[PDB]
Coordinates of all heavy atoms in Angstrom, one line a residue:
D207 N 0.8 -1.2 0.0 CA 0.0 0.0 0.0 C 0.9 1.2 0.0 O 1.7 1.4 0.9 CB -0.9 0.0 1.2 CG -2.0 1.1 1.1 OD1 -1.7 2.3 1.4 OD2 -3.1 0.9 0.6
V208 N 0.7 2.1 -1.0 CA 1.5 3.2 -1.2 C 1.3 4.3 -0.1 O 2.2 4.9 0.4 CB 1.3 3.9 -2.6 CG1 1.9 5.3 -2.7 CG2 1.8 3.0 -3.8
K209 N 0.0 4.5 0.2 CA -0.4 5.6 1.1 C 0.1 5.3 2.6 O 0.6 6.2 3.3 CB -1.9 5.8 1.0 CG -2.5 6.9 1.9 CD -4.0 6.8 2.0 CE -4.3 5.6 3.0 NZ -5.8 5.5 3.5
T210 N 0.0 4.0 3.0 CA 0.2 3.6 4.4 C 1.6 3.0 4.6 O 2.1 3.0 5.7 CB -0.8 2.6 4.9 OG1 -0.7 1.4 4.1 CG2 -2.2 3.2 4.8
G211 N 2.1 2.4 3.5 CA 3.4 1.7 3.6 C 3.3 0.2 4.0 O 4.3 -0.5 4.1
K212 N 2.1 -0.2 4.3 CA 1.9 -1.6 4.7 C 2.1 -2.7 3.6 O 1.7 -2.5 2.5 CB 0.6 -1.9 5.4 CG 0.5 -1.3 6.8 CD -0.8 -1.6 7.5 CE -1.1 -3.1 7.7 NZ -1.9 -3.2 8.9
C213 N 2.8 -3.8 4.0 CA 2.7 -4.9 3.1 C 1.3 -5.6 3.1 O 1.0 -6.2 4.1 CB 3.8 -6.0 3.5 SG 3.9 -7.3 2.3
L214 N 0.5 -5.4 2.1 CA -0.8 -6.0 1.9 C -0.7 -7.5 1.7 O -1.4 -8.3 2.3 CB -1.5 -5.4 0.8 CG -1.8 -3.8 1.0 CD1 -2.5 -3.2 -0.2 CD2 -2.6 -3.6 2.3
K215 N 0.3 -8.0 0.8 CA 0.4 -9.4 0.6 C 1.9 -9.8 0.4 O 2.7 -9.0 -0.2 CB -0.4 -9.8 -0.7 CG -1.8 -10.1 -0.4 CD -2.6 -10.4 -1.7 CE -4.1 -9.8 -1.6 NZ -4.9 -10.6 -0.7
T216 N 2.2 -11.0 0.8 CA 3.5 -11.7 0.5 C 3.2 -13.0 -0.2 O 2.6 -13.9 0.4 CB 4.3 -12.0 1.8 OG1 4.5 -10.9 2.6 CG2 5.7 -12.7 1.5
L217 N 3.6 -13.1 -1.5 CA 3.4 -14.2 -2.3 C 4.7 -15.1 -2.4 O 5.7 -14.5 -2.7 CB 3.0 -13.8 -3.8 CG 2.0 -12.7 -3.9 CD1 1.8 -12.3 -5.4 CD2 0.6 -13.1 -3.3
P218 N 4.5 -16.3 -1.9 CA 5.6 -17.4 -2.0 C 5.8 -17.8 -3.4 O 5.5 -18.9 -3.8 CB 5.0 -18.5 -1.1 CG 3.5 -18.4 -1.4 CD 3.2 -16.9 -1.5
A219 N 6.3 -16.8 -4.2 CA 6.1 -16.8 -5.6 C 7.1 -17.7 -6.4 O 6.7 -18.3 -7.4 CB 6.2 -15.4 -6.1
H220 N 8.3 -17.9 -5.9 CA 9.4 -18.5 -6.6 C 10.3 -19.3 -5.6 O 10.2 -19.2 -4.4 CB 10.2 -17.5 -7.4 CG 9.4 -17.0 -8.6 ND1 8.9 -15.7 -8.7 CD2 9.1 -17.6 -9.8 CE1 8.3 -15.5 -9.8 NE2 8.4 -16.6 -10.5
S221 N 11.3 -20.0 -6.2 CA 12.2 -20.8 -5.3 C 13.7 -20.3 -5.6 O 14.6 -21.1 -5.5 CB 12.0 -22.3 -5.5 OG 12.2 -22.7 -6.9
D222 N 13.8 -19.1 -6.1 CA 15.1 -18.5 -6.5 C 14.8 -17.0 -6.5 O 13.6 -16.6 -6.6 CB 15.6 -19.0 -7.8 CG 16.5 -20.2 -7.7 OD1 17.4 -20.3 -6.8 OD2 16.3 -21.2 -8.5
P223 N 15.9 -16.1 -6.5 CA 15.6 -14.7 -6.5 C 14.6 -14.2 -7.6 O 14.6 -14.9 -8.7 CB 17.0 -14.1 -6.7 CG 18.0 -15.1 -6.1 CD 17.3 -16.5 -6.2
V224 N 13.8 -13.3 -7.3 CA 12.7 -12.7 -8.2 C 13.4 -11.6 -9.1 O 13.8 -10.6 -8.5 CB 11.5 -12.2 -7.5 CG1 10.4 -11.6 -8.5 CG2 10.9 -13.3 -6.6
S225 N 13.5 -11.8 -10.4 CA 14.1 -10.9 -11.3 C 13.3 -9.7 -11.9 O 13.8 -8.6 -12.1 CB 14.7 -11.7 -12.5 OG 13.7 -12.4 -13.1
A226 N 12.0 -9.9 -12.1 CA 11.1 -8.8 -12.4 C 9.7 -8.9 -11.9 O 9.3 -10.1 -11.6 CB 11.1 -8.7 -13.9
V227 N 9.0 -7.8 -11.8 CA 7.6 -7.7 -11.4 C 6.9 -6.6 -12.2 O 7.5 -5.5 -12.3 CB 7.4 -7.5 -9.9 CG1 7.5 -8.9 -9.1 CG2 8.2 -6.4 -9.4
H228 N 5.7 -6.8 -12.7 CA 5.1 -5.8 -13.6 C 3.6 -6.0 -13.4 O 3.1 -7.2 -13.4 CB 5.5 -6.0 -15.1 CG 5.0 -5.0 -16.0 ND1 5.1 -3.6 -15.8 CD2 4.5 -5.1 -17.3 CE1 4.6 -3.0 -16.9 NE2 4.2 -3.9 -17.8
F229 N 2.8 -4.9 -13.3 CA 1.3 -5.0 -13.4 C 0.9 -4.9 -14.8 O 1.6 -4.3 -15.7 CB 0.6 -3.8 -12.6 CG 0.6 -4.0 -11.1 CD1 1.6 -3.4 -10.3 CD2 -0.4 -4.8 -10.5 CE1 1.6 -3.6 -8.9 CE2 -0.4 -4.9 -9.1 CZ 0.6 -4.3 -8.3
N230 N -0.3 -5.6 -15.1 CA -1.0 -5.4 -16.4 C -1.7 -4.1 -16.5 O -1.8 -3.3 -15.6 CB -1.9 -6.6 -16.8 CG -3.1 -6.6 -15.9 OD1 -3.2 -6.0 -14.8 ND2 -4.1 -7.4 -16.3
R231 N -2.4 -3.8 -17.7 CA -2.9 -2.5 -18.0 C -3.9 -2.0 -17.0 O -3.9 -0.8 -16.7 CB -3.5 -2.6 -19.4 CG -4.1 -1.3 -19.9 CD -5.7 -1.5 -20.1 NE -6.1 -2.3 -21.2 CZ -5.8 -2.0 -22.5 NH1 -5.0 -0.9 -22.7 NH2 -6.2 -2.7 -23.5
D232 N -4.7 -2.9 -16.4 CA -5.7 -2.5 -15.4 C -5.4 -2.8 -13.9 O -6.2 -2.6 -13.1 CB -7.1 -3.0 -15.8 CG -7.2 -4.5 -15.7 OD1 -6.3 -5.1 -15.2 OD2 -8.3 -5.0 -16.2
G233 N -4.2 -3.4 -13.7 CA -3.7 -3.6 -12.3 C -4.2 -5.0 -11.7 O -3.8 -5.4 -10.6
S234 N -5.1 -5.7 -12.4 CA -5.7 -6.9 -11.9 C -4.7 -8.1 -11.9 O -5.0 -9.1 -11.3 CB -7.0 -7.2 -12.7 OG -6.7 -7.5 -14.1
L235 N -3.7 -8.0 -12.7 CA -2.7 -9.1 -12.8 C -1.3 -8.6 -12.5 O -0.9 -7.5 -12.8 CB -2.7 -9.8 -14.2 CG -4.0 -10.5 -14.6 CD1 -3.9 -10.8 -16.0 CD2 -4.2 -11.7 -13.8
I236 N -0.5 -9.5 -11.9 CA 1.0 -9.2 -11.8 C 1.7 -10.4 -12.5 O 1.4 -11.5 -12.3 CB 1.4 -9.2 -10.3 CG1 0.9 -7.9 -9.6 CG2 3.0 -9.2 -10.1 CD1 0.9 -8.1 -8.1
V237 N 2.7 -10.0 -13.3 CA 3.6 -11.0 -13.8 C 5.0 -10.9 -13.1 O 5.4 -9.8 -12.8 CB 3.8 -10.8 -15.4 CG1 4.5 -9.5 -15.8 CG2 4.5 -12.0 -16.0
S238 N 5.6 -12.1 -12.7 CA 6.9 -12.1 -12.2 C 7.8 -13.2 -12.8 O 7.3 -14.1 -13.5 CB 6.9 -12.4 -10.7 OG 6.3 -13.7 -10.4
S239 N 9.1 -13.0 -12.7 CA 10.0 -13.9 -13.3 C 11.1 -14.3 -12.3 O 11.3 -13.5 -11.4 CB 10.6 -13.3 -14.6 OG 11.3 -12.1 -14.1
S240 N 11.9 -15.3 -12.5 CA 12.9 -15.7 -11.5 C 13.9 -16.6 -12.1 O 13.7 -17.3 -13.1 CB 12.2 -16.4 -10.3 OG 13.1 -17.0 -9.4
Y241 N 15.1 -16.5 -11.5 CA 16.2 -17.5 -11.8 C 15.7 -19.0 -11.7 O 16.4 -19.8 -12.4 CB 17.4 -17.4 -10.9 CG 18.1 -16.0 -11.1 CD1 17.8 -14.9 -10.2 CD2 19.2 -15.9 -12.0 CE1 18.5 -13.7 -10.3 CE2 19.8 -14.6 -12.1 CZ 19.5 -13.6 -11.3 OH 20.1 -12.4 -11.3
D242 N 14.6 -19.3 -11.1 CA 14.1 -20.7 -11.0 C 13.5 -21.2 -12.3 O 13.2 -22.4 -12.4 CB 13.0 -20.9 -9.9 CG 11.7 -20.1 -10.2 OD1 11.4 -19.7 -11.3 OD2 11.0 -19.8 -9.2
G243 N 13.5 -20.3 -13.3 CA 13.1 -20.8 -14.7 C 11.7 -20.5 -15.0 O 11.2 -20.8 -16.1
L244 N 10.9 -19.8 -14.1 CA 9.5 -19.6 -14.3 C 9.1 -18.2 -14.5 O 9.8 -17.2 -14.0 CB 8.8 -20.2 -13.1 CG 9.0 -21.7 -12.6 CD1 8.3 -21.9 -11.3 CD2 8.7 -22.7 -13.7
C245 N 8.1 -18.1 -15.3 CA 7.4 -16.8 -15.3 C 6.0 -17.1 -14.7 O 5.3 -18.1 -15.1 CB 7.4 -16.3 -16.7 SG 6.0 -15.3 -17.1
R246 N 5.6 -16.3 -13.8 CA 4.3 -16.5 -13.1 C 3.4 -15.3 -13.2 O 3.9 -14.2 -13.2 CB 4.4 -17.1 -11.7 CG 5.0 -18.5 -11.7 CD 5.1 -19.1 -10.3 NE 5.0 -20.5 -10.4 CZ 5.2 -21.4 -9.5 NH1 5.5 -21.0 -8.2 NH2 5.1 -22.7 -9.8
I247 N 2.1 -15.6 -13.2 CA 1.0 -14.5 -13.2 C 0.1 -14.7 -12.0 O -0.5 -15.8 -11.8 CB 0.2 -14.5 -14.5 CG1 1.1 -14.2 -15.7 CG2 -0.9 -13.5 -14.4 CD1 1.5 -15.4 -16.5
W248 N 0.0 -13.6 -11.3 CA -0.6 -13.6 -10.0 C -1.9 -12.7 -10.1 O -1.9 -11.6 -10.7 CB 0.3 -13.0 -9.0 CG 1.6 -13.8 -8.9 CD1 2.7 -13.6 -9.6 CD2 1.8 -15.0 -8.1 NE1 3.7 -14.5 -9.3 CE2 3.1 -15.4 -8.4 CE3 1.1 -15.7 -7.2 CZ2 3.7 -16.5 -7.8 CZ3 1.6 -16.9 -6.6 CH2 3.0 -17.2 -6.9

């Protein structure tokens, strides 16, 4: 949360360092990538 600074969510997203994170056009989706070989959509 930008206004308050709180961590709203922690996603156990990957099993190696997370290399990128990006929102889609309307904010409803997040894409992430990692050294673990995966690209994931949250």
Side-chain angles (χ1 to χ4, degrees):
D207 190 278
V208 166
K209 184 197 70 165
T210 63
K212 285 182 67 148
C213 185
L214 300 176
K215 276 173 217 288
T216 303
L217 315 175
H220 288 107
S221 60
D222 270 312
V224 178
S225 60
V227 281
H228 184 48
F229 282 95
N230 71 343
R231 180 248 285 300
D232 69 6
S234 65
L235 295 168
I236 288 158
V237 67
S238 60
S239 60
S240 168
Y241 297 92
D242 65 19
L244 306 174
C245 152
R246 292 180 154 173
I247 296 98
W248 304 92

